RNA sequence: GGUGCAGAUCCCGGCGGUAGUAACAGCGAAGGGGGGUGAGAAUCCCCCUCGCCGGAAGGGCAAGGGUUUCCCGGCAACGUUCGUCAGCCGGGAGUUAGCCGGUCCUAAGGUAGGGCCUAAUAGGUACCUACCGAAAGGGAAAGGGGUUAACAUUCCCCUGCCUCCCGGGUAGGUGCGGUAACGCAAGCCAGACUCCUGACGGAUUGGGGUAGGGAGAGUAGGACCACCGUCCUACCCAAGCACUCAAGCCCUUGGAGAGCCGUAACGGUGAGAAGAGGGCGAAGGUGUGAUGGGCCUUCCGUUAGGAGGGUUCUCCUGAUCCCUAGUCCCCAUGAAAAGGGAGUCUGGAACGAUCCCGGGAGACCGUACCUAGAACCGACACUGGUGCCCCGGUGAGAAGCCCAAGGCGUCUGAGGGGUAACCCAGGCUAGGGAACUCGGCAAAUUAGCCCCGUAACUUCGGGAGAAGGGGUGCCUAUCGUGGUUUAACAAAGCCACGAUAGGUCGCAGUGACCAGAGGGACCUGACUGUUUAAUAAAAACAUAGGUCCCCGCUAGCCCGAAAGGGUGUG
RNA sequence: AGCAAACUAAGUACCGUGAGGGAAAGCUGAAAAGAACCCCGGAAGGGGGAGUGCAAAGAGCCUGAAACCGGGUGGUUAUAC
RNA sequence: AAGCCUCCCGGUGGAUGGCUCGGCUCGGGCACCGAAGAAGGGCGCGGCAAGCAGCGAAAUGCUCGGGUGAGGCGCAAGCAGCCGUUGACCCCGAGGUCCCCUAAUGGGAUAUCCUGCCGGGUUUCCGGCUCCCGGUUUAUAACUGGGUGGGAACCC
């Protein structure tokens, strides 16, 4: 009664793995007369042969967790939290993004004539000395 | 027969449209051509792995062109 | 040289399939001659050769003929079909 | 097969002569890409348009051709006007076009 | 599997064949029951290289 | 440890091939030699007269 | 005369008793219902379901094995039980290359023949010549879709590329553009010399990609429907050829300071900055390859087949894989060749390609399968060793826990039991809290992250996570900072991190999982490292620092029988 | 025993990385006349009835000892070496 | 009942007895092989062929003489076929073919496998290719003709 020979050629046929591939119990004596490529391939077609499709884990709890922990906060707090804070924000890019942000305003502002080259030049090394915070800090600053 | 450095991998699917994913083996890169004493590789010059059969197109057109630049040469003429 | 034609089952389906035959010669390693050994014995004309050497010791060949000849004239005159 | 393709054609004026270009795309985010620069791109295209007819040096040394304007989709048709410096301009018009068999 | 050819280019007494008696014989000689005196295993007796 | 693990590392290529004159398995690879008959520095067969009590 | 056995932990052969007894548990898995075949089913086959792995129990390939591979038929032995099953037994079969590897090159190293030595060689070898030495180093050129029971960058189809040789043209011999960097169809054959790829460490960082992974819209199919309407699957494209390129380095102009330019950081500049133009230029990308496939799906006949539909759009995240630049470090300075390309000269002929088109050729050998709780070594289908390379939520994470894709219930003996004593692993205990004991051994306590706070001593670096104190869930809304999108800033869509206000429940909010008990005093070795493979990991060995001795090279110290040799390319 | 080797392959199988080490095992009958056929059994030089032969210890085959085990004969046994 | 002693029958076992195409010791004969490629090894060859023995791509045997006279196709009894009275098989004498490694010898082999350069006809294929000696040819070029390994013991 052994048929490993069919359950082996249907799966690489299909493209499954070979526990996707189910047989018909009322249609076994037409499976069991198989034993070229050209005869799995037609039983696969006339359903003889069934191939279960992959699954996937459902998003929908992931979606709607995820949803709250933006807009409310909700899951991301300090009792959240196993990981160092370095490991959670590098300290290197947010220093990175803090001081690219000012270079490539304070040049826009240049280039357009707005200020002049001193204080093009003034704002570029209080900028490296960590004087301002922020984009917002340095535009409070130029509005004096 | 695992992995080895003198061959580089790369995985395709960006400019793609069929459906699965393997992974090739090619060669490092090359470099200009090569011994060494006097160490500067030029401008205008081509290094491909195989050959084109180009002349010219792997060569600038002045006298010394392909040899070196104004550098190291005019202690030779 | 020619030592016997090979008829098993998956010899018959190159004839009808792939237009080759399926020779076992003897394995003297210095080989340019199966082409023109076949296509003076047979009078048939010769595209490709592919060699074997199988773990029992024999030396097969996949000879494959040409479109304007077909290699069941030639295995029906060997007998074989 | 492939379904759908997307025709760009584009009618380059400089003085007194006229080119056309044709080229086409597979998914329509490649079109905005392509016109995303459009200097390079067109300049490239104009190095195959001679290679295949003849001559050469017809308006190739021109400075920065400044990129495109907006694009506008009417009838599913897209639409710009992309100029550079000055007796240089170039008119793009990009056709979807459904292939079936 | 990298075979440098006098193993698996020679064929014979050096990888090659491990065979029960033919069935001709066993009738031919009437032999009570006829056996290969030198069978062997790959998983239990060792081949010389 | 002596016994059972260290026996483990010894599925490598062998020190021992095949010998061509004699036909026996004791061409020493690494020595360019066999340990059986001197093949590889000796033209005569090697052989000792202890090699068989009397 | 090989001449008499009860003993020699006598030698060999056969057989008892123990005894139908131990063992077939332990290393974190598990079966149940229905049906079949067969003389005979806990154990083989089919369907449903349940459980386990999921940085390995899944995928890919070595050395080694050697036919274990695939089909058919079996069950005397073989498998820790059974067996109708099998890596077992009988009968047939199976490995296809110009482009993959060997083949070639040299490395550390070796050998043969000459010389020198030896009583002699199958012995030694500093020298000369030749050869050998890597299936993970170097090394011309291929991809996709398909095909078998078993092979496939090897066979078929489509699209190619390399080296050499023919035939027909053409660029050259006698040609052009640019201030320049450079742009290009540029002669041929025979040499010489030269140059540059080949061709090279560690650490750390930016930028650009790609595999992968997500959200939304739509079209088909599936799963659930006590009430909601959500959830799963498919939506995609190779090499070659054309075009494009950031970093870097170059070329014209220009002419700056008590200053300007610029980075993540170091920095750059009259030996020429910024600003304007340009030249050479990755990984990739976009077209073509491809009205070709392969993916999902509907209907009819249900034999052979036939006839249709779809395969689109907008964004985000992202490598430990790829290429590209910085910088730093050494009493470390981090292979060699064959084989490639180019340049400059000399000689020769006037016919002639490194460019297009057509034709021919490219030996020889390997290729099946496993690659390991059953294919290798360990006497065994041995919990050991031999392997290397790869792989959604919570979370810092390749951890622990749960689950996809894939695989398994063969780490191959089962059933019954209100489940005795006892043993191996585990949970909890009132009152007391080391009274136990050589000894607090074992077990318990603590534990993540944020904020505050932190002594003596000290070689001034440390001690130090010293010690100690407070906070943490869920829900409802917000704010701030930053990324990305053809995107200075501001708007819009996605995304990450840090905070704020209010409401609320429990014995308990790092609620499981993961996860330091702390302090005072003395000896000893300074420290990181090493050791008795199989009873000793230490205070023993080493170490950096200190100090002493020999020696000017035909030396000092050491090896050899000699020729000679190591330190010494000093 | 006789050479280690009287035999389906002795320096053969098998053991060791290697130099090397190193077995076991003879016999139906004068002649295969080697047990047709019938009942049982999945099968089995398996059981029973037959048949061949001077004779079936008939393929595990000359003779067929003892230890050991099973069945039976004759004595005897649960108040005592 | 557990049993106990003795004999009989059976099983298991393989002693005893008988046998023997094998050994062991003496006497007597006889006594070298190899570059014209030895001894030793490896792979092949049978219609079905695994081993031993025999043989080598002419491969379980080819040719010519002599002997013998009816079967033959080894150990080894099957299925099937063939050879022989035109004298086979078998024995003796003389020839032919005689793969690879091997002193191994054109070069290389940790590949029993690869790969050259001259000459000849010409598919195949066949000859030549360290240390010395006597010669040729121009002189270090090239060419003609002439030890190496094995053997049970004995020997120097």
New interface residues.
Partial sequence: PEFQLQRRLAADIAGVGLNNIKFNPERLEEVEEALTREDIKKLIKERAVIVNPKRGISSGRLKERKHKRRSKGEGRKHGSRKGKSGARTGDKEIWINKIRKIRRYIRWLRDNNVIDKHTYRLLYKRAKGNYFKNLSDVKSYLRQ | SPQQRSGSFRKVFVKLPSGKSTIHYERRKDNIARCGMCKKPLNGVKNNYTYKYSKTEKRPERVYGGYLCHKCLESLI | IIKEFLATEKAVKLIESQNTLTIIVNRNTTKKDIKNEVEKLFSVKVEKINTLITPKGEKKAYVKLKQEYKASDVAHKLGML | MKVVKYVLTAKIDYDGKEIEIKRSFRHRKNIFEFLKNADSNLKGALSEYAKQNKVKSSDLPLNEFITCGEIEEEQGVMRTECKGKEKVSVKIEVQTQKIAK | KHKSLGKKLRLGKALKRNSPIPAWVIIKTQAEIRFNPLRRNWRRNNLKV | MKGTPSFGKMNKT?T???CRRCGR?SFNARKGYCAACGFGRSKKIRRYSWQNKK
């Fill in positions: 062998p021992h091939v095949r398995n």
